[PDB]
Structure 1
Amino acid sequence: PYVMMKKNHEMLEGNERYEGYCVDLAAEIAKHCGFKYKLTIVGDGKYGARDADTKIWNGMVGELVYGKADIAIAPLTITLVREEVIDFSKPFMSLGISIMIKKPQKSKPGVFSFLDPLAYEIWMCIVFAYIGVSVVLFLVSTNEFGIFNSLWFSLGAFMQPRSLSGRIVGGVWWFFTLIIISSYTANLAAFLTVERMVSPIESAEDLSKQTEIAYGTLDSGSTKEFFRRSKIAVFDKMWTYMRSAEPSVFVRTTAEGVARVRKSKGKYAYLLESTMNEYIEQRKPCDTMKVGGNLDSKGYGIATPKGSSLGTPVNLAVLKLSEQGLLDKLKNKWWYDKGECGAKDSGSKEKTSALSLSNVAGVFY
Structure 2
Amino acid sequence: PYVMMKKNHEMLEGNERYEGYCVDLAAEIAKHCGFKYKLTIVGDGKYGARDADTKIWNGMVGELVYGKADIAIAPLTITLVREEVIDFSKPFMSLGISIMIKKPQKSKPGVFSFLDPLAYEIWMCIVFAYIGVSVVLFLVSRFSPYSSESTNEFGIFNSLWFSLGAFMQQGCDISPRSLSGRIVGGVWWFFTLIIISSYTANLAAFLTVERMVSPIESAEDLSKQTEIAYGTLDSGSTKEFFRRSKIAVFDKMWTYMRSAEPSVFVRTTAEGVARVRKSKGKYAYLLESTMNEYIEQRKPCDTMKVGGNLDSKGYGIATPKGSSLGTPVN
Q: Please give the TM-score of this superposition, normalised by the length of structure 2.
A: 0.64
Pair 1:27–1:118, CA change in 2 (3 A) = farther
Query: Contact between 2:65 and 2:320, CA under 8 Å: does it hold in 1?
Result: yes
Pair 1:245–1:38, CA change in 2 (3 A) = closer
Pair 1:98–1:168, CA change in 2 (3 A) = farther
Tell me the CA shift for residue 198 of structure 1. 3.1
Pair 1:183–1:223, CA change in 2 (3 A) = same
Counterpart for residue 213 of structure 1 = 228
Per-residue deviation, residues 118-172 of structure 1 (Å, max 9, x unmatched): 9999999999999999999999999999999999999999999679999999999
Tell me the CA shift for residue 203 of structure 1. 0.5
Query: Contact between 1:77 and 1:301, CA under 8 Å: does it hold in 2?
Result: yes
Distance between the aligned counterparts of 1:250 and 1:67, measured in 2? Answer: 29
Tell me the CA shift for residue 24 of structure 1. 0.6
> Which consecutive residues of structure 1, in runs of 5 or more, have no partner in the other structure?
316-365
- Kindly, what percent of the aligned residue pairs are identical? 100
Give secondary structure in 2 for the equivalent of 1:261: helix
Query: Contact between 1:86 and 1:303, CA under 8 Å: does it hold in 2?
Result: yes
Pair 1:6–1:173, CA change in 2 (3 A) = same
Tell me the CA shift for residue 25 of structure 1. 0.8
Per-residue deviation, residues 70-111 of structure 1 (Å, max 9, x unmatched): 322111221222222322111112223221111231349999
Distance between the aligned counterparts of 1:81 and 1:3, measured in 2? Answer: 25
Using the TM superposition, name which of 246-255 and 19-28 deviates more.
Answer: 246-255
Per-residue deviation, residues 247-294 of structure 1 (Å, max 9, x unmatched): 554445544433332233223322223233333323432211221112
Distance between the aligned counterparts of 2:259 and 2:133, measured in 1? Answer: 57
Pair 1:40–1:85, CA change in 2 (3 A) = same
Query: Contact between 1:105 and 1:197, CA under 8 Å: does it hold in 2?
Result: no
Query: Contact between 1:130 and 1:157, CA under 8 Å: does it hold in 2?
Result: no
Query: Contact between 2:243 and 2:254, CA under 8 Å: does it hold in 1?
Result: yes
Query: Contact between 2:135 and 2:156, CA under 8 Å: does it hold in 1?
Result: no
Using the TM superposition, name which of 57-66 and 173-182 deviates more.
Answer: 173-182
Per-residue deviation, residues 316-364 of structure 1 (Å, max 9, x unmatched): xxxxxxxxxxxxxxxxxxxxxxxxxxxxxxxxxxxxxxxxxxxxxxxxx
Tell me the CA shift for residue 21 of structure 1. 0.9
Using the TM superposition, name which of 107-116 and 282-291 deviates more.
Answer: 107-116
Using the TM superposition, name which of 32-41 and 114-123 deviates more.
Answer: 114-123
Using the TM superposition, name which of 111-120 and 221-230 deviates more.
Answer: 111-120
Tell me the CA shift for residue 67 of structure 1. 4.5
Q: CA RMSD in A?
A: 8.0
Using the TM superposition, name which of 259-268 and 166-175 deviates more.
Answer: 166-175
Distance between the aligned counterparts of 2:181 and 2:275, measured in 1? Answer: 63
> Which consecutive residues of structure 2, in runs of 5 or more, have no partner in the other structure?
141-149, 169-174
Residue 151 of structure 2 corresponds to residue 142 of structure 1: yes
Distance between the aligned counterparts of 1:54 and 1:243, measured in 2? Answer: 19
Pair 1:62–1:264, CA change in 2 (3 A) = closer
Pair 1:197–1:145, CA change in 2 (3 A) = same
Give secondary structure in 2 for the equivalent of 1:143: coil
Query: Contact between 2:100 and 2:284, CA under 8 Å: does it hold in 1?
Result: yes
Query: Contact between 1:131 and 1:157, CA under 8 Å: does it hold in 2?
Result: no
Aligned residues: 315
Query: Contact between 1:95 and 1:297, CA under 8 Å: does it hold in 2?
Result: yes
Q: Please give the TM-score of this superposition, normalised by the length of structure 1.
A: 0.59
